[PDB]
Every structure is written in structure tokens, then in C-alpha cells.
Amino acid sequence: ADCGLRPLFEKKSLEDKTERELLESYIIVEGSDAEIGMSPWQVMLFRKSPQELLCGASLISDRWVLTAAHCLLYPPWDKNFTENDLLVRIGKHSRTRYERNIEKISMLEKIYIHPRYNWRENLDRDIALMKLKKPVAFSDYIHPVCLPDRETAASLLQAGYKGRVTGWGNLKETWTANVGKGQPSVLQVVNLPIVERPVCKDSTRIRITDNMFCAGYKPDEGKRGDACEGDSGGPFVMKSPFNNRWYQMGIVSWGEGCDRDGKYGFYTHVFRLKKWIQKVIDQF
């Protein structure tokens, strides 16, 4: 009920450095350092052993975390994680450090993957929920994002309208680490424009469904940016200009290379899968 309102920004009426870019449009590679508390709903899916970052995710209540299904189940790469294999890290900023007194670590209680998730062909319905064993305590760095309703999705999911993607994924498509620019020290953020469905389809050979949308700049626009390895499962948000709340419209799903010209990032269409989300949450 208090979703999408950040403690360090909306709550005290302060704006972050680029949110105006999104509003102006209403009618991670090549991104930048996120401000503190800029994304209170940001979650890190963490592998117990070997301790590493699996994916991005988002907090939608004190007990539920949203993410991409391929983050937990992807037979092609022999990926099939179970509850105890993971941990969710919330309230983070630094990628590798254990942020004492600020971040909170949660154990998973149950994984819920969309029954019709298409890992075989095009990642259709790439969505998954995670119920935490215990509620997480909200704070200045920990707060849930809102989920879109039909009207909100209808007015904001338009070509040209920009959204925001965050994560600790790679800085470059080309394999790189802490030596020649590859892994970021802190959370990265990038604002990207939603793209016209026809354009999305013409950019790939893969079959695009209504449960997905694509975002990113066209080669002619000069500006760049995209998600990359380590960023999947992360949130694609938008700030409603109607009520000034942040809404998660998409989930980082897939692409073909990172930040490639003529190519775009694909995201899970959260609203189209909201009924499933509701059922799961209501049923369990």
C-alpha cells in the first residue's frame, strides 16, 4: 500500500539524478552508478556455494521476491536451483561487500515457477516468485516496488516511454573482470526506451510473444545501454506520473549480445502475468 515510494526520495520529496528523464519521455552496459536508496526494491539472488551472484530480483512485499524463471530453471545450461541452494540479499549497493547493518539476508521458503514458462523455445512467461522464510524489515534501503494494474500498464507501456533497469551484471558483453573493466563495484542503473513491437520482432529470429516487450536505443539515436550477464531477473521500472509511484513493468529476460546495435533487450511483461502472481500469493 506504501509501495513505489522510496524512503530517501519520494518520502522526503527528493528526486534522484535521472528520474526526470523518464517523466520527460511520458508523452548493465553503458549505465552508471546508482544513488544510495535509489532502488530499495533491488534484490540479489545469491548462491550459497560457491558464493556468487546468480541474478537480480525485486521485492514486492515483506515476504515476496519477484524474478526471472530462467534464473532458477534453465535445462539447457543444466540450471535447476532449489530452495536451500539460494539466498536473497536485500538493501544492497556494493556488489561484493557484506554491507553490515544495512543489507538483510533471507533464506528461501518456496520457489514458484510459472507453469507455462517456455524454457525450450523463447523464454515465454519468464517469471518466478520466491517466498521468504521470514518477513524482511523495511528501512531506508529496503522497500517494495509496486506491481502494475491494467490502467497503469495501459498508460505507461508505450513506445518511446522510458523505463529504468538496475543490476550488478557485467559492464561489457565481452568477458571481463576486475582488471580491464567487467564487474561493477556498485549497483548500476540505466534508463531505456520501450520499443515498438514491430521493431522488436524485426530485430531477431526468435518468436516474440505478448508476454514480453523490448527496450533499448536504436542505432540512429546515439545513446546506448542494456542489461547483461548477471542482470537477469532484475527489475524494469517506471515512475508513474499520475501518483508518483514506481512500478515494475518488466523483468530482465533475454537478449542477443549486450548493447548491440540493431538489437534490444527483452523483458517479461509483468502485468500480463499478474493473475498468476495474484493466485500464487493468494493461494499460498
Binding site: 558464493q51 561484493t96 557484506y98 533464506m107 573482470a177
Partner: peptide, 10 residues
């Protein structure tokens, strides 16, 4: 690369 988290959560 990743700092050691407390065993309490492991």
C-alpha cells in the same frame, strides 16, 4: 571476489 558473509545465514 565476494566478501565472506556470516555463517549464520549459510
Amino acid at each position: 571476489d565476494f566478501e565472506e558473509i556470516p555463517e549464520e545465514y549459510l
